[PDB]
């Protein structure tokens, strides 16, 4: 379990985590309570693995779309701010953190993607997507490129897939209809196809990802990127004379980014709920607190009314909001997880030529990717339970083991990679062969993973995968 008398906080690496820790440093000064900020990778998948078991951060930070699934699964504590406090933030930002009419997180800021462009390469950013192919052709002539953005995260390609009719779940009079999914409609198809054609036509690379794009943009190699506010800081530093503008249209339609409210949730299992509330309410959610984080990496349009009045006057925030209006707040329902996984899968396959646009989106429609993952996973789970079954069956009803072995084993367990660790004696360093298969990648199984069974009878929390070399060409 979490340590009593401190606060651990998970925020994502792209955000303003050093500003946040200064707010944490001020909280320490006053109360004496150590505040640690960490940014583990794949935070929003890591958080429910570890929280589910009574472990993890005191406070988690993320866009409100994952909180629905966290609260459904009972991992977030109900927050109770008083009336006075709720008047300090916007109504629509409480809406995003509401799950079954309970408030399950604090709103921090609104974030929407914008077209970021280089004023020296492009005095006039284009108004339409269609314009981009011709634009790339004349910038390739200058040893440069029209547009780079992260193609490996569906959040970035969605404004374009939604432009002309693609939608997650249909909204109808207050309710989302999880039986009405708009990923494989004609609009979704057109947008993805246009995106795949830019690649076939070598205007974009399938490989391109967050850091290649950021680097490429900040070095003045590409005229345009698509990113959020958090990215503006590293641009200011690169001294590229940059603008932030409305996303270009597709087939005359606005691109429709999905809008996120950055929110702060409290771990249901935390013994520090009270410290968390005071920290969030009296230190972070204040001009002082937000300005500290905004000055690290800009937050977008903040939820704290009084600070937003100062930030609202920035053309960049103005532009954030204009794309916000054109888009759509993300649903926060628990199916969001499967949704995102499906579209991630679809975009990547379509991008890399593994499936056609038709084939990819149809699988996203039918939820095939996440269902295959659940098949391989439940086979492993079953197999690891069976191993445990056997081990217990022996150790209880088999003939008496050595009147001189130990009472104290680490039990048969299945890690997050699918490796089943067998029941082992305390002190043991245990070798198991590297997964044959992991996230679409095949590994050399004649090398091993390593996990230590501690001298007390518990598995060490770190597992040594360092030796698992993939092999795919």
């Amino acid at each position: 379990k979490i340590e009593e008398g401190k606060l651990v906080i998970w925020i994502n690496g792209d955000k303003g985590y050093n500003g946040l820790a200064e707010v944490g440093k001020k909280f320490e000064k006053d109360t004496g309570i150590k505040v640690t900020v960490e940014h583990p990778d794949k935070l929003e998948e890591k958080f429910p693995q570890v929280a589910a078991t009574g472990d993890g951060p005191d406070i988690i930070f993320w866009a409100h779309d994952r909180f629905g699934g966290y609260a459904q699964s009972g991992l977030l504590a109900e927050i109770t701010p008083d009336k006075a406090f709720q008047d300090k933030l916007y109504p629509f930002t409480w809406d995003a953190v509401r799950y079954n009419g309970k408030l399950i997180a604090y709103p921090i800021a609104v974030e929407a993607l914008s077209l970021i462009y280089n004023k020296d390469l492009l005095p006039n950013p284009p108004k339409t997507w269609e314009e981009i192919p011709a634009l790339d052709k004349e910038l390739k002539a200058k040893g440069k490129s029209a547009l780079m953005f992260n193609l490996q995260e569906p959040y970035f390609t969605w404004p374009l897939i939604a432009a002309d009719g693609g939608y997650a779940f249909k909204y109808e009079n207050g309710k989302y209809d999880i039986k009405d999914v708009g990923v494989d409609n004609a609009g979704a198809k057109a947008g993805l196809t246009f995106l795949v054609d830019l690649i076939k036509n070598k205007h974009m690379n399938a490989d391109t990802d967050y850091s290649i794009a950021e680097a490429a943009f900040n070095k003045g190699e590409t005229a345009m990127t698509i990113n959020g506010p958090w990215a503006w800081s590293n641009i200011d530093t690169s001294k590229v004379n940059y603008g932030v503008t409305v996303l270009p249209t597709f087939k005359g339609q606005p691109s429709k980014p999905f809008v996120g409210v950055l929110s702060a949730g409290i771990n249901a299992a935390s013994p520090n709920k009270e410290l968390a509330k005071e920290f969030l309410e009296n230190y972070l959610l204040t001009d002082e607190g937000l300005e500290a984080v905004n000055k690290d990496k800009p937050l977008g349009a903040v939820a704290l009314k009084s600070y937003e009045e100062e930030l609202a006057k920035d053309p960049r925030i103005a532009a954030t909001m204009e794309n916000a209006q054109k888009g759509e707040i993300m649903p926060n329902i628990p199916q969001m997880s499967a949704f995102w996984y499906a579209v991630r899968t679809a975009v990547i396959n379509a991008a890399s030529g593994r499936q056609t646009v038709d084939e990819a989106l149809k699988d996203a429609q039918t939820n095939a990717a996440a269902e295959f993952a659940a098949l391989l996973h439940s086979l492993l789970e079953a197999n690891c339970s069976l191993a445990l079954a056997e081990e217990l069956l022996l150790d209880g009803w088999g003939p008496p083991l050595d009147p001189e072995g130990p009472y104290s084993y680490c039990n048969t367990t299945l890690d997050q990679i699918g490796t089943c660790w067998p029941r082992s004696a305390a002190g043991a360093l245990v070798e198991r062969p590297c997964p044959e298969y992991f996230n679409g990648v095949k590994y050399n199984t004649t090398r091993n993973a390593y996990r230590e069974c501690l001298e007390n009878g518990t598995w060490a929390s770190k597992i040594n995968y360092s030796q698992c070399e993939p092999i795919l060409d």
Binding site: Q416, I417, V441, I463, Y465, P470
Partner: peptide, 14 residues
């Protein structure tokens, strides 16, 4: 190649 490079990050954390 360009997705085996991501698993290395996951392996490193896990």
């Amino acid at each position: 190649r360009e997705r085996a490079e991501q698993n290395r990050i996951i392996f490193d954390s896990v």
